[PDB]
Design an enzyme around this catalytic site. Structure first.
Site, PDB file in Angstrom:
ATOM      1  N   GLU A 174     -17.499   3.699 -19.035  1.00 59.50           N
ATOM      2  CA  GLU A 174     -17.275   3.068 -20.392  1.00 59.50           C
ATOM      3  C   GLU A 174     -15.463   2.232 -20.359  1.00 59.50           C
ATOM      4  O   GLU A 174     -15.505   1.673 -20.058  1.00 59.50           O
ATOM      5  CB  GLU A 174     -16.395   4.563 -20.732  1.00 59.50           C
ATOM      6  CG  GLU A 174     -15.253   5.135 -20.237  1.00 59.50           C
ATOM      7  CD  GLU A 174     -15.582   6.695 -20.251  1.00 59.50           C
ATOM      8  OE1 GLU A 174     -16.317   7.577 -19.907  1.00 59.50           O
ATOM      9  OE2 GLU A 174     -13.589   7.009 -20.545  1.00 59.50           O
ATOM     10  N   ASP A 183     -17.225   7.218 -15.123  1.00 57.73           N
ATOM     11  CA  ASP A 183     -15.695   7.368 -15.720  1.00 57.73           C
ATOM     12  C   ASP A 183     -15.606   5.927 -16.691  1.00 57.73           C
ATOM     13  O   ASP A 183     -16.532   5.540 -17.087  1.00 57.73           O
ATOM     14  CB  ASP A 183     -14.051   7.625 -15.844  1.00 57.73           C
ATOM     15  CG  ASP A 183     -14.314   9.195 -14.658  1.00 57.73           C
ATOM     16  OD1 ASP A 183     -14.971   9.614 -16.181  1.00 57.73           O
ATOM     17  OD2 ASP A 183     -13.833   9.534 -13.953  1.00 57.73           O
ATOM     18  N   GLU A 207     -20.568   6.753 -27.239  1.00 55.76           N
ATOM     19  CA  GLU A 207     -20.144   8.238 -27.288  1.00 55.76           C
ATOM     20  C   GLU A 207     -19.586   8.756 -28.628  1.00 55.76           C
ATOM     21  O   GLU A 207     -18.658   8.017 -30.063  1.00 55.76           O
ATOM     22  CB  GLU A 207     -18.519   7.929 -26.401  1.00 55.76           C
ATOM     23  CG  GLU A 207     -17.225   9.054 -26.396  1.00 55.76           C
ATOM     24  CD  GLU A 207     -18.387   9.913 -25.678  1.00 55.76           C
ATOM     25  OE1 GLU A 207     -19.574  10.637 -25.843  1.00 55.76           O
ATOM     26  OE2 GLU A 207     -17.517  11.665 -25.497  1.00 55.76           O
ATOM     27  N   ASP A 224      -9.713  17.085 -18.347  1.00 56.97           N
ATOM     28  CA  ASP A 224     -10.099  15.200 -18.436  1.00 56.97           C
ATOM     29  C   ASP A 224      -9.954  14.208 -18.601  1.00 56.97           C
ATOM     30  O   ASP A 224      -9.577  14.043 -20.142  1.00 56.97           O
ATOM     31  CB  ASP A 224     -11.973  15.867 -19.151  1.00 56.97           C
ATOM     32  CG  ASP A 224     -12.626  14.607 -19.749  1.00 56.97           C
ATOM     33  OD1 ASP A 224     -13.143  14.733 -20.070  1.00 56.97           O
ATOM     34  OD2 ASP A 224     -12.557  14.304 -18.040  1.00 56.97           O
ATOM     35  N   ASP A 239     -21.338  10.804 -13.953  1.00 54.45           N
ATOM     36  CA  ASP A 239     -20.552   9.632 -14.748  1.00 54.45           C
ATOM     37  C   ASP A 239     -19.538   9.456 -13.887  1.00 54.45           C
ATOM     38  O   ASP A 239     -19.764   9.793 -12.620  1.00 54.45           O
ATOM     39  CB  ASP A 239     -18.698  11.260 -15.827  1.00 54.45           C
ATOM     40  CG  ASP A 239     -18.421  10.389 -16.199  1.00 54.45           C
ATOM     41  OD1 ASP A 239     -17.645   9.836 -16.064  1.00 54.45           O
ATOM     42  OD2 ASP A 239     -17.757  11.210 -17.291  1.00 54.45           O
ATOM     43  N   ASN A 290     -25.013  11.980 -26.173  1.00 54.69           N
ATOM     44  CA  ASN A 290     -24.140  12.738 -25.639  1.00 54.69           C
ATOM     45  C   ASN A 290     -23.812  14.294 -26.435  1.00 54.69           C
ATOM     46  O   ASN A 290     -22.918  13.868 -27.369  1.00 54.69           O
ATOM     47  CB  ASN A 290     -23.076  12.043 -25.181  1.00 54.69           C
ATOM     48  CG  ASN A 290     -22.157  13.342 -24.432  1.00 54.69           C
ATOM     49  OD1 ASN A 290     -22.544  14.361 -23.637  1.00 54.69           O
ATOM     50  ND2 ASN A 290     -20.502  12.640 -24.068  1.00 54.69           N
ATOM     51  N   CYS A 330     -11.280  12.639 -21.868  1.00 52.81           N
ATOM     52  CA  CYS A 330     -12.794  12.692 -22.950  1.00 52.81           C
ATOM     53  C   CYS A 330     -12.769  12.349 -24.120  1.00 52.81           C
ATOM     54  O   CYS A 330     -11.847  12.500 -25.239  1.00 52.81           O
ATOM     55  CB  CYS A 330     -12.583  14.650 -22.990  1.00 52.81           C
ATOM     56  SG  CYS A 330     -14.039  15.240 -23.551  1.00 52.81           S
ATOM     57  N   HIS A 351     -22.145   6.498 -15.305  1.00 54.30           N
ATOM     58  CA  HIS A 351     -21.864   5.890 -16.906  1.00 54.30           C
ATOM     59  C   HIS A 351     -20.122   4.946 -16.876  1.00 54.30           C
ATOM     60  O   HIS A 351     -20.017   5.769 -16.218  1.00 54.30           O
ATOM     61  CB  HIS A 351     -22.374   6.678 -17.800  1.00 54.30           C
ATOM     62  CG  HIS A 351     -21.478   8.169 -18.277  1.00 54.30           C
ATOM     63  ND1 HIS A 351     -20.647   7.598 -19.096  1.00 54.30           N
ATOM     64  CD2 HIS A 351     -22.029   9.360 -18.198  1.00 54.30           C
ATOM     65  CE1 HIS A 351     -20.234   8.857 -19.228  1.00 54.30           C
ATOM     66  NE2 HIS A 351     -21.120  10.006 -18.802  1.00 54.30           N
ATOM     67  N   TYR A 369     -27.458  16.098 -15.320  1.00 54.75           N
ATOM     68  CA  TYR A 369     -26.090  15.413 -15.447  1.00 54.75           C
ATOM     69  C   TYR A 369     -24.217  15.526 -14.605  1.00 54.75           C
ATOM     70  O   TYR A 369     -24.725  16.885 -15.449  1.00 54.75           O
ATOM     71  CB  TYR A 369     -26.033  15.445 -16.740  1.00 54.75           C
ATOM     72  CG  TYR A 369     -23.924  15.063 -17.472  1.00 54.75           C
ATOM     73  CD1 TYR A 369     -24.410  12.712 -17.434  1.00 54.75           C
ATOM     74  CD2 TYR A 369     -23.122  15.078 -17.881  1.00 54.75           C
ATOM     75  CE1 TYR A 369     -22.953  12.348 -17.780  1.00 54.75           C
ATOM     76  CE2 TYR A 369     -22.459  14.764 -18.394  1.00 54.75           C
ATOM     77  CZ  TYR A 369     -21.961  13.301 -18.171  1.00 54.75           C
ATOM     78  OH  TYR A 369     -20.840  12.710 -18.883  1.00 54.75           O
ATOM     79  N   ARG A 371     -21.250   2.876 -21.743  1.00 56.31           N
ATOM     80  CA  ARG A 371     -20.477   3.923 -23.147  1.00 56.31           C
ATOM     81  C   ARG A 371     -19.504   2.730 -23.426  1.00 56.31           C
ATOM     82  O   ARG A 371     -18.710   1.543 -23.169  1.00 56.31           O
ATOM     83  CB  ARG A 371     -20.115   5.120 -22.403  1.00 56.31           C
ATOM     84  CG  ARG A 371     -19.420   5.674 -23.214  1.00 56.31           C
ATOM     85  CD  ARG A 371     -18.822   7.451 -22.016  1.00 56.31           C
ATOM     86  NE  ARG A 371     -18.012   7.643 -22.699  1.00 56.31           N
ATOM     87  CZ  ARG A 371     -16.995   8.449 -22.620  1.00 56.31           C
ATOM     88  NH1 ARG A 371     -18.023   9.079 -21.678  1.00 56.31           N
ATOM     89  NH2 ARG A 371     -16.498   9.289 -22.564  1.00 56.31           N
TER      90      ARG A 371
HETATM   91  O1  LIG Z   1     -18.989  15.360 -19.299  1.00 54.62           O
HETATM   92  C1  LIG Z   1     -18.061  14.343 -19.078  1.00 54.62           C
HETATM   93  O2  LIG Z   1     -17.669  13.907 -18.295  1.00 54.62           O
HETATM   94  C2  LIG Z   1     -18.091  13.262 -20.994  1.00 54.62           C
HETATM   95  O3  LIG Z   1     -17.860  12.028 -20.689  1.00 54.62           O
HETATM   96  O4  LIG Z   1     -20.207  13.313 -20.833  1.00 54.62           O
HETATM   97  C3  LIG Z   1     -17.722  13.999 -21.645  1.00 54.62           C
HETATM   98  F1  LIG Z   1     -18.550  15.515 -22.513  1.00 54.62           F
HETATM   99  F2  LIG Z   1     -16.660  14.571 -21.258  1.00 54.62           F
HETATM  100  C4  LIG Z   1     -17.173  13.161 -22.773  1.00 54.62           C
HETATM  101  O5  LIG Z   1     -16.465  12.129 -22.506  1.00 54.62           O
HETATM  102  O6  LIG Z   1     -17.597  13.516 -24.019  1.00 54.62           O
HETATM  103 MN   LIG Z   2     -16.926  11.954 -18.576  1.00 54.79          MN
END
Ligand SMILES: O=C(O)C(O)(O)C(F)(F)C(=O)O
Ligand SMILES: [Mn+2]
Ligand SMILES: O=C(O)C(O)(O)C(F)(F)C(=O)O
Ligand SMILES: O=C(O)C(O)(O)C(F)(F)C(=O)O
Ligand SMILES: O=C(O)C(O)(O)C(F)(F)C(=O)O
Ligand SMILES: [Mn+2]
Ligand SMILES: [Mn+2]
Ligand SMILES: [Mn+2]
Lengths: 301, 301, 301, 302
Positions: B115, B88, B190, B58, B86, B213, B123, B113, B43, B160
């Protein structure tokens, strides 16, 4: 008026006392950590760029685009830390070396180094290297010098020679002399094989600032930063200062995760902690400062 | 013809005894190291992408460009290994959700993924998150589905939702439902806040693979893989698997360097050592096969 | 069940009666325009790319990144339309020729040509060219064939030589046959100098598909598709079929904007007309099918 | 010291007498051509970038990465000629507007413009435009201005509204104003409906230097260089000035290539000729001066 760290790095390598200590970083994080540890200079490794951006060994795989973007972003993490950046062999001839210079200058990059290998270059501490004759080599350096002049950049031009291995000591020195004549600023003899020889280059190029590549367990015997200052060097670089540690730890970590089924990070390492290493708090100040309200409330919990 | 790991994962997703365990990586080095340790899936953390590429937290700083590039390289280190990458929010409306899909597909990405946050995202384990409504979101999940099937791609679309912290469990489930109807392959709640709730999603959305996650020390209590498997999840990610440990080890190592003036890497960590972790042997074969001379007598000193 | 023009073109070249007309395009615009014209193939010119991406001449300033990006994006305007992508000298030795072959193949590119100059190559109709020896060249072709094959790609490898000017007719042919023996799909004798060389070469490698490069007013007499077909070529390209006319048209429009101080584009160049040249309608559909109301209404008035 | 064309222009803009004429270029060819025609300023069209870099319409496809790269290569061909670069909406919230401002400064971009659209923007001459709100928008403006000072760039922050089509004239001017207020240097009422309003908007925002976007055959009636100067603009841009003609010429070239089976380009267009249009001579001088002999005996065929 915009500012570059080329300028104050340039003044320091004009002061014959101030000594420049630069750990080798390879990406956003290593650069943030080495900053937090209180270093006043960074070194962007070509090898480490290869590792992180491509997952690949130090074999000329990195492109000018590759190196420049990495060199750029590393430079503006803290715009007053001079960043010394690898530039391998210039990504071509004069036309190209100038673009690299111009590019690295605009980028805020404080110095760079051009070596004498063929463009499909090799890590310096690797056997069977292939070089370019002295004339072509000088031509790269003379392009980089003429390139910076034309745009009025202070970017510090570092002339690396990889020739000791292939061609013997005497010839590598002839190369460094010839680079000094085309206007280079610092001399870089790669893979020094002895203290006799570190001592011997320094006198043979007396009054030209030289740089030591303290890559460990290769061709070069361990010299601490203090001893190097003391020997006469003006810069010492630690290309794997981050990369090494990071490999050992991820490895153990992934084997732990494998047997276990969860990482088990220390309870200190929270995402906010982890983010703070990367400038979270400064990043939210920027938003609150300009009228935004997105980090209204903070960010915990 | 050309193959991609989309089809394995999508196949494995159908046999309801297969349980996908994927640790977080975020650059080439972490990737090679995760692979070296025997993982069957990777991942790529967005957070980790932001941090390594940009040195930034993030917060939607990564562009599609950043993300994709990083996704493609990681995916092609080991082509037969599926990579869950990811994405976003799709980097735009539908037009972009669609280029995101095609490009990740062509890159050889196995799953991704999307969201329900605004594009200017954050994040999932920080307070404040701002969301888009259900229709817009569904529009995105539909855009990915439509674009994949338009190119004949088997890439796995993971739906997500980041809406539990502000809208509540009920809503979060309703958005997963919509998504499921829209054609997503896998649900992604999430920030699952308890074991009660983990068992509970699985039930409310029974029949439909879900991802857990497993980011430690955030909103989710620590559930091991074996335990997630037993609950009924189909994939478990651990975003900070390499990153936490690399940040610890480098911070350590930089602190040591500062007091010591020489990094003192274990002797095992020669340059060759490190390149060999990054595919040096294989890169050296490509040449020899082709058949080049460059590498002749290998590279040992 | 992802698909790629490479395979369509592989097949075309398997039947000697198929004839291929591929105009030079250098950017998205040229590409859309040529597609609208009905053309069944495209040639992404390296020269071209340098001019648009960089505002530079064809001197080897484009890196792999530039050329891959351009090639991909062109290739995916009409995914079913084969794109013959210039690939210079492969952006390095074997390692880089594979990466070139891998990337191009993942990008949907149908075919690429590799030549025999030094990496800092120039356009084949300039004087001066500098060449690498035959072995080093063959090593390139060999890496692309291998690289192709390791990944199961159908991409067409087109072997180019620029040796005519410096080494003469017979060395040229020697190089070409040497590349054929290494698995190359198509021969490409840059800047053929007469219509009877034209015919000499076609019977010199008979059975093997040949490309004619119809760049005007350099080295090559003006030969047409009709005439080329007759001669026994398999592929005809025109690197500047879009480029030159664009230059000349822009030159005249800039003078007229100079003097008259308003462009005075024709009543039909509306923004919307221009956008429909680049898939507006199709990408408005993408949205709707998802579907958002973004272009709900329409876009006009 | 490295020198930015952003300074030369900041100062040109304090001169109430200096009028700036800037044609829209979108790739290196269209830059090099514009320059030789003798223009003292260039405009990087957001639209044209989408088209040339992507083959796509003007819809928010371009990312910062995309736009910065074009903007950078375009500034640095003639580095003394100011380049006014599209910046769309700044690619996100402050954080991103900050990075854009930063990268465009390092690149040598003289000026850039930021609009009040949703981040999935469209050409300001299409219908359907969906805006963001005034606060949100001032946040963007205020961020490019704070970012700029944080690093000491002269970079000119142009304020643009698309709000005329959607929310009327008076709202349009309210936004433009809120933004002069947060420190923007140049105003941009996009998509002016008539010539009496082009006259009006200058009056309403007297004090403050304004830009006319002269895009033909959309919303704005055609107004010329001398004509906008008279009215009292400081900058006029023509975004499709390279791209309209190129489209027309290429469409024709293709039809001819089918008809004739060869382009039939003019005896004048040698490869050398096109290359020199792209600075081949300059390029070759860089090599010679550095001691390279790659271009010995020159490069014209024998
Ligand atoms: O690793 C990521 O980017 C993620 O989206 O899984 C996370 F860990 F940051 C999150 O948003 O929980
Ligand atoms: Mn992320
Ligand atoms: O860090 C580097 O990239 C380097 O060039 O300095 C090196 F360390 F790999 C080397 O080649 O010595
Ligand atoms: O278009 C090209 O890049 C080319 O290689 O075919 C050429 F025109 F420049 C040439 O070298 O003939
Ligand atoms: O050139 C552009 O991108 C532009 O912003 O000026 C425009 F013309 F598309 C517009 O939005 O009017
Ligand atoms: Mn290096
Ligand atoms: Mn070419
Ligand atoms: Mn625009």
């Amino acid at each position: 008026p915009m500012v570059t760290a080329a300028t104050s790095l340039r003044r320091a390598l004009e002061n014959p006392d101030s000594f420049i200590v630069a750990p080798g970083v390879y990406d956003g994080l290593s650069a943030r950590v080495a900053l937090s540890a209180g270093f006043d200079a960074l070194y962007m490794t070509g090898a480490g760029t290869a590792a992180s951006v491509h997952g690949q060994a130090d074999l000329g795989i990195c492109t000018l685009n590759d190196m420049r973007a990495n060199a750029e972003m590393i430079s503006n993490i803290s715009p007053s830390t001079p960043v010394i950046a690898d530039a391998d062999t210039g990504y071509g001839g004069p036309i190209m070396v100038a673009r690299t210079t111009e590019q690295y200058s605009r980028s805020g990059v404080a110095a760079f180094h051009i070596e004498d290998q063929v463009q499909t270059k090799r890590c310096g501490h690797l056997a069977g290297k292939i070089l370019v004759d002295t004339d072509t080599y000088v031509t790269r350096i003379r392009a980089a010098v003429q390139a910076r002049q034309r745009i009025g950049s202070d970017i510090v031009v570092i002339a690396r020679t990889d020739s000791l291995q292939t061609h013997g000591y005497e010839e590598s020195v002839a190369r460094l002399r010839a680079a000094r004549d085309a206007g280079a600023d610092v001399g870089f003899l790669e893979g020094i094989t002895s203290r006799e020889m570190a001592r011997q280059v320094i006198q043979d190029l007396a009054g030209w600032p030289l740089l030591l590549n303290m890559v460990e367990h290769g061709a070069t015997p361990s010299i601490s930063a203090a001893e190097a200052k003391e020997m006469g060097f003006r810069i010492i670089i630690f290309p794997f200062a981050a990369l090494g540690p990071a490999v050992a730890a991820m490895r153990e970590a992934m084997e732990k995760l494998k047997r276990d089924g969860i990482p088990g990070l220390d309870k200190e390492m929270t995402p906010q902690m982890l983010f703070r290493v990367c400038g979270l708090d400064e990043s939210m100040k920027v938003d609150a400062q300009a009228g935004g309200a997105a980090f209204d409330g903070g960010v915990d919990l």
